[PDB]
Amino acid sequence: AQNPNCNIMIFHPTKEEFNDFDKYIAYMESQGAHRAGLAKIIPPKEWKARETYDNISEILIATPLQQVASGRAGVFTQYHKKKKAMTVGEYRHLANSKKYQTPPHQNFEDLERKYWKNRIYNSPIYGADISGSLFDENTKQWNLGHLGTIQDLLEKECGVVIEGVNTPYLYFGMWKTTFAWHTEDMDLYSINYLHLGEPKTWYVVPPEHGQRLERLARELFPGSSRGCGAFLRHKVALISPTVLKENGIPFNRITQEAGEFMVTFPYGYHAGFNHGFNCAEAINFATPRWIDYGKMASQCSCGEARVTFSMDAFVRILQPERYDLWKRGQD
Ligand SMILES: O=C(O)CNC(=O)C(=O)O
Ligand SMILES: [Mg+2]
Numbered sequence: 001a002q003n004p005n006c007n008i009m010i011f012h013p014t015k016e017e018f019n020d021f022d023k024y025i026a027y028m029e030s031q032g033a034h035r036a037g038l039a040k041i042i043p044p045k046e047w048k049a050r051e052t053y054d055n056i057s058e059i060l061i062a063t064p065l066q067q068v069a070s071g072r073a074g075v076f077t078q079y080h081k082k083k084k085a086m087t088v089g090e091y092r093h094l095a096n097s098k099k100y101q102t103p104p105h106q107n108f109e110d111l112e113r114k115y116w117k118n119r120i121y122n123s124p125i126y127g128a129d130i131s132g133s134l135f136d137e138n139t140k141q142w143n144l145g146h147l148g149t150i151q152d153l154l155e156k157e158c159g160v161v162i163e164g165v166n167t168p169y170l171y172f173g174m175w176k177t178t179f180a181w182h183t184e185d186m187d188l189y190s191i192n193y194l195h196l197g198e199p200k201t202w203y204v205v206p207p208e209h210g211q212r213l214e215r216l217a218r219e220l221f222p223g224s225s226r227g228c229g230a231f232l233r234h235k236v237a238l239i240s241p242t243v244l245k246e247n248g249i250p251f252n253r254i255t256q257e258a259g260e261f262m263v264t265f266p267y268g269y270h271a272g273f274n275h276g277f278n279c280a281e282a283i284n285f286a287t288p289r290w291i292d293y294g295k296m297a298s299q300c301s302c303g304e305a306r307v308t309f310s311m312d313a314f315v316r317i318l319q320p321e322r323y324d325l326w327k328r329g330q331d
């Protein structure tokens, strides 16, 4: 068995290897990358996502989200308070203000210590989930707006044509902006490209050990667990590395820098935080190996998780027993 310790693997494809996305995902899996739940892909030196980032300031963040925490420093939830619209240029200036900027630090490890110590005492503002792309249309390799769609994959694997579309999303971050512990919708893959700015630190639990994280989460968030049988679908709970280590939960960590891709694998729980002003782009995708994970994915039916239009068909076809109750949650 390749990568039996479930370490995060880092890949350096050549420009030739960067041509065929599906093939390269399958290669990484042949080497055991999926066992970690997360992999890093450093693009060939010849590749670029676009020529420059000099003209992005007029992108609108229609609903910036202030991420307000409740709890203790290593075990907290966050809720999102909607703020007034602002441009990327306005948001960048806000991120660099004295109130929100990254503090002085020695190295990524020191910054990580400061994040876990101090996150809860601040409410950073995240520009998340903005439909769009920063890849140039002429970028032919690993262009996250030109991937094969999940609907086409389901149709190729299973023979059933379904409605829905699959487009990318932009994320504009600042110091302390936080992504809570989650797997993807329908336990899909994700791919995330850090276009510019400061790093993003990731934490991940191997897919084979996901249920250990879920059990800890039920213990640590006992009211939320009674409210919903899949409350991590709400994407609000944070648990620190120290708390995970105290409770014996297997996990790994890695920092993504600008110009790097990260891939999350089916049922790989992940969480993390941004180091400072940055912009990332991410999208879900599927491969043949996903189908079995899609069929078994948990679902929120309490009504809180509320997701995209395209998830309907995935539930309806892969999880027909659950369909009824899940759709009651969505309506
Ligand atoms: O970058 C973020 O805020 C969160 N991204 C992801 O969870 C992802 O790419 O799957
Ligand atoms: Mg612009």
Ligand code: NI
Binding pocket: 182, 183, 184, 190, 264, 270
């Ligand atoms: Ni994710």
Ligand SMILES: [Zn+2]
Binding pocket: 227, 228, 229, 230, 231, 233, 234, 300, 301, 302, 303, 304, 305
């Ligand atoms: Zn729920």
